[PDB]
Amino acid sequence: SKALGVLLAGPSGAERVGLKQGGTVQDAINWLTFDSFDIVKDGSKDVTADIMAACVVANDLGLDIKQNDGTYLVSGNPVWPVYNSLDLNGVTLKLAAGFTGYFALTQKDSTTVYGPTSPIVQAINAAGGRTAGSGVLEGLVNSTELNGKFLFMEGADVLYYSRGTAKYWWTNTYLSNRGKLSDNLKYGVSAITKITAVTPRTKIVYYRLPNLDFGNGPANNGVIRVLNNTRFIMQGGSISNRPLKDVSKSPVIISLNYCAAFKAYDFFDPYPAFAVDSNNSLVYSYTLNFNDIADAVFENFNSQGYGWGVVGGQRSTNITYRDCNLNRVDMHNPYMGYLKVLDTRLGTWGINASGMGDMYLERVTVDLDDSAHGGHREHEGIINARGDFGGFHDGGLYIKDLTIVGEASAFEATSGHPVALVSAYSFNAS
Amino acid sequence: SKALGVLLAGPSGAERVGLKQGGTVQDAINWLTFDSFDIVKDGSKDVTADIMAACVVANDLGLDIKQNDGTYLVSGNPVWPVYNSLDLNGVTLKLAAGFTGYFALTQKDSTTVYGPTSPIVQAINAAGGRTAGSGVLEGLVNSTELNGKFLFMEGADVLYYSRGTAKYWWTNTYLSNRGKLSDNLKYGVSAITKITAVTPRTKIVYYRLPNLDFGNGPANNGVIRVLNNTRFIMQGGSISNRPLKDVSKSPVIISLN
Question: Which of A86, A411, B166, B180 is spaced 20 to 30 Å from A235 by Cα?
């Protein structure tokens, strides 16, 4: 009836084979692979739906995914969710021209949102501790609901105007217990309107990014997206066969959102994207793009050359760049806390960051050559504030051992003078 | 005749055993070990030719090698080539007194040499951008041949003399596209005579070095050699039983190129 060989090939097969050191083969193996589902890996078939089914199985069982070879063709707009570690070092993804999907690397059941009518928010608004330089919220001293969490708060006071739109009070910080915040409030607020709380993991997860093939020239808004995540380490990843021109497109590679306490590592990009409009004028495109992050370290990133700035950040806290090779470091919406750039080589754009904190620079080299861009230059200096936010930087700038090479002659021919060192101004006061 | 016992021991095998989470045992294991070839690992036999055979199989299939225990006795002057990751943490290599071989960790066709007569070199020599502080080679503005590569170039002008021997112009840099260099030239050069171009990997490889036993005292010119390589991480490694004196010898451990 039920014979060996038929039993061995079934799901309960590895449980019947014993090991010399003890136990069975099933005990040792505890991970999943793409080969476990017979996914075609010669690039000759669309496997968008097959990869999605594999991710669903792993999330239910709570296992890691490992795969170190093969090339896969994908198309459409899938959303692949991953709740655990993912190892794709050695895998190439071949994207179709109309691809608009992404990997969604998330933490399961990690975020709670409190609205303006929630009991927690009302208790904060009825007590003190909402002044500048405060480090304690007096309304949470005898409460344990938000203990040991990362808090992303919003307020009801206007701070500045950007492109005619009012921007409101905000603060990202960490709460240990009895109302104590890690980062003090730089400005006071009349009332709190929203709180987003993220719980740190009880474990460390590892992401090993694959190689992305851009031969057909897709223009997604992020292929690797990390949302509501803590305590992860991201290593590797690259781009291949990137086209020289990207007419009327704005590709984005990596995007982060509501993340804290992580570190990224040696992503390699042979050269950045060069995207233009119908009038042959440069438009934006990013290799890395993040919103609402805290306590982040970026090390050994590589994206240097002509094109738009490869980094775009907004509303962050305590960011560090170490040993990187980028053509720009940027923050559109202001940062708070500190921003550190250590042992880094920069391109012609320099640094463009409005902020409510302190900027530290140590052993940084800047290369000013800008021949491929005609004379286009948004800000006239090397270290700048944001011209579309008013040009303010409410904090100090401390520089040690800065080195300048290049000349930036293309900009000089258009304007008549070289670049400044530090600039802070507004494009339009209204 | 095709008995189940004989079938299970062949190359078909783990593909006939299923896992609870899905797939087969074969789909989970994708690496090679020194124990896969029954290499004697108590130091009582010379296994130089057996280690070479293991490396050839791994290179052909594009797999990684992993071994975490055992002591191996080696001799001669073998060249063991490795194209992928290598893990020898916990392994001791016993070197015979006359050992002169090494591991060769390479990148499998990552380099290209352009000589003084190549069209690429002649294009550079016929244009501008060869001055001090220059960041662009004007002869490559409309070329895509060297895009995204590391360049090791040599020139024709004498810079200084060492031990009565002239030394010539050089520079090492990276080129993104449209002839833009990452590091500006410090001195101008009249003509460029050689270019070596290395392509970065689309992956990261990991090297975990073994323990080397120098009891017999060999003095070869490098036991671990890395050539024409990019995007790797090296960890570990040690020396044991190093003699206090090395009369008429010059040992080298690690060399890069």
Answer: B180
Q: In chain A, whose CA is at the least distance from the CA of B64?
A: A68
The residue count of chain A comes to 430
> For residue A147, what are the CA distances in angstroms to A154, A200, A383, A416, B177?
19, 11, 39, 57, 51
Residues of B in contact with A369 (CB under 8 A): 135-136, 180
Count of CB atoms situated within 10 Å of the CB of A34: 24
Burial group, residue A151, by CB count within 10 angstroms (0-12, 13-18, 19+): buried
Distance from CA of B148 to the nearest CA of A (A): 5
Long-range CB pairs of A159-162, under 8 A, 24+ apart, other chains included:
A159/A187, A160/A389, A160/A390, A160/A392, A161/A390, A162/A388, A162/A389
A4: its two tokens: 């060996």
The CA distance from B194 to B8, in Å, is: 56
* Among A154, A189, A167, CA closest to A388: A167
The total of other beta-carbon atoms located within 10 Å of residue B218's CB is: 19
- The method recorded for this entry reads cryo-EM
- In angstroms, the CA A261 to CA A84 distance is 17
Cα-based distances in Å from A363 to A304, A403, A407, B133: 18, 8, 19, 20
How far, in Å, CA of A204 to CA of A263, rounded?
11
**Residue A259: its H or E element:** strand A252-264
| The two three-digit tokens of residue B242, written as one number | 């190093």
- List the single residue in B21, B177, B184 with the smallest CB-CB distance to A271: B177
- Rounded Cα–Cα distance for residues B4 and A5 (Å): 8
Contact A270 B176 (CB under 8 A): yes
- CA dihedral in degrees (B33, B39, B43, B44; nearest 10)? 170
Measured CA to CA, the distance from residue A366 to residue A368 in angstroms comes to 6
Exposed e or buried b per residue across A305-344, where buried means at least 16 C-beta atoms within 10 angstroms of its C-beta = bbbbbbbbbbbbbbbbbbebbbbbbbbbbbbbbbbbbbeb
Tell me the one-letter amino acid at A132. A
Residue A417 tokens read as 């003078």
Q: Look at phi and psi of residue A420 and say left if phi exceeds 0, alpha if psi is from -120 to 50, else beta.
A: beta
d(CA A179, CA A144): 9
Nearest CA in chain B to A236: B204
Q: How many residue pairs from chains A and B have C-beta atoms closer than 8 A?
A: 120
Classify A34 as helix, strand or coil.
Answer: helix
Helix/strand/coil percent split, chain A, to 5: 10, 45, 45
Closest-CA residue of B relative to A371 is B136
**Do the chains contact at A367 and B24, CB–CB below 8 Å?**
no
Resolution stated for this PDB structure, in Å: 2.5
Q: Please tell me the distance in Å from B46's CA to the nearest CA on chain A.
A: 27
The sign of the torsion formed by the CA atoms of A7, A12, A14, A18 equals negative
Specify whether the CB–CB gap between A292 and A269 falls below 8 A.
no
Residue B233, phi then psi, degrees to nearest 5? -125, 125
Residues forming a β-bridge with A325:
A302, A345
Question: Side-chain half-sphere of A114: how many Cα atoms within 13 Å?
Answer: 20
Cross-chain CB nearest to B148 (options A36, A89, A270): A270
Q: Is A108 exposed, middle or buried (0-12, 13-18, 19+ CB in 10 A)?
A: exposed
Instruction: State the Rg of chain A over Cα.
Output: 25
**Strand ranges, E, within A7-99:** 32-33, 42-46, 65-66, 71-74, 79-82, 86-87, 92-95
* Distance, CA of B118 to CA of B126 (rounded, Å): 13
Tokens of B241: 């039983």
Q: What is the CA radius of gyration of chain B?
A: 24
**CB atoms B22 and A13 under 8 Å:** no
